[PDB]
RNA sequence: GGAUUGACAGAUUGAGAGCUCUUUCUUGAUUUUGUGGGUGGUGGUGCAUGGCCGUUCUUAGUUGGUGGAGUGAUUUGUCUGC
């Protein structure tokens, strides 16, 4: 569901858990750091997503949310001073959650479900 | 899918300065380039100013209130003496 994703992104934004990008994401996945990964399939030439898959194959669970620009928007990359979006364009190709921070029950049931697949 | 940051080694440099280049690696929204604006300045103006000090002046000199004289600026009080 949509709720657990925003909850986990908030809990990793406040405690610096988001590997906002792909190089930091790749380094976190290579290390014992990246506990979750959200990436978009609407990526040109698709090789970055394939490389990410590989990173998660070796810290396993991944999420397949679309709308890269929207993904960055609700990923907290924006300063979002006003109520509405105050920046033209901002987005993230890959988001990696390292620090689980605060825990909510619905989100943990969701991550167990996505682990079960 | 990199605003950016930093650097081993060499050219360069006086430098063991990643100042600049060769290559590449690191770093994550603090930044970078433009506008407004702001700071910093033993920059200018002591002939824009404050404060302070110096000097006129180490002398004994100043001042206003009622009163008198002048239309008045001013004067007497602040003086002939000792
Ligand atoms: Mg100065
Ligand atoms: Mg100077
Ligand atoms: Mg003067
Ligand atoms: Mg005097
Ligand atoms: Mg009089
Ligand atoms: Mg007199």
Under 8 Å between Cβ of A24 and A113: no
Beta-carbon contacts of A82 under 8 Å, excluding residues fewer than 6 positions away, are none
Chain breaks in chain A (C to N over 2.5 A) after: 58
Scanning residues 6 through 65 of protein chain A, those with a beta carbon under 7 Å from any atom of strand B turn out to be 20-25, 27, 43-45, 48
* Alpha carbon of residue A30 to chain centroid: 16
CB atoms within 10 A of CB A71: 22
Cβ A18 vs Cβ A75: under 8 Å: yes
Q: Residue A78: give the domain boundaries.
A: 1-117
Q: Which nucleotide lies nearest residue A69, CA to C1'?
A: B1
For residues A9 and A14, give the distance between their C-alpha atoms in angstroms, rounded to a whole number. 9
Backbone φ, ψ for residue A47 (5° rounding): -75, -30
| Contact between residue A45 and residue A70 where contact means Cβ atoms under 8 Å apart | no
CB A4 within 8 A of CB A104: yes
**CA/C1' separation A68–B14 (Å):** 53
Q: Nearest nucleotide to A48 by CA–C1' distance?
A: B1
Q: What sign for the dihedral angle of Cα A47, A75, A21, A18?
A: negative
Phi-psi region of A67 (alpha: psi -120 to 50; beta: other; left: phi over 0): left
Nucleotide with C1' nearest the A72 CA: B1
CA of A58 to the centre of ligand 5 (A): 111
Number of domains in chain A: 1
Return the CATH number at A51: 3.30.1330.30
Beta-carbon contacts of residue A46 (< 8 Å; ≥ 6 apart): none
């Amino acid at each position: 569901i949509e709720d657990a994703l925003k909850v986990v992104l908030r809990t990793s934004l406040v405690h610096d858990g988001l590997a906002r990008g792909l190089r930091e994401s790749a380094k976190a996945l290579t290390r014992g750091e990246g506990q979750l990964a959200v990436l978009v399939e609407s990526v040109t030439e698709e090789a970055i997503s394939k490389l990410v898959q590989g990173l998660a194959t070796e810290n396993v669970p991944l999420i397949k949310v679309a709308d890269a620009k929207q993904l960055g928007e609700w990923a907290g990359l924006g300063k979002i001073d006003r109520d509405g979006n105050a920046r033209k364009v901002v987005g993230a190709s890959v988001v990696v959650v390292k620090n689980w921070g605060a825990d909510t029950q619905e989100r943990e049931i969701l991550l167990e479900h996505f682990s079960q697949q």
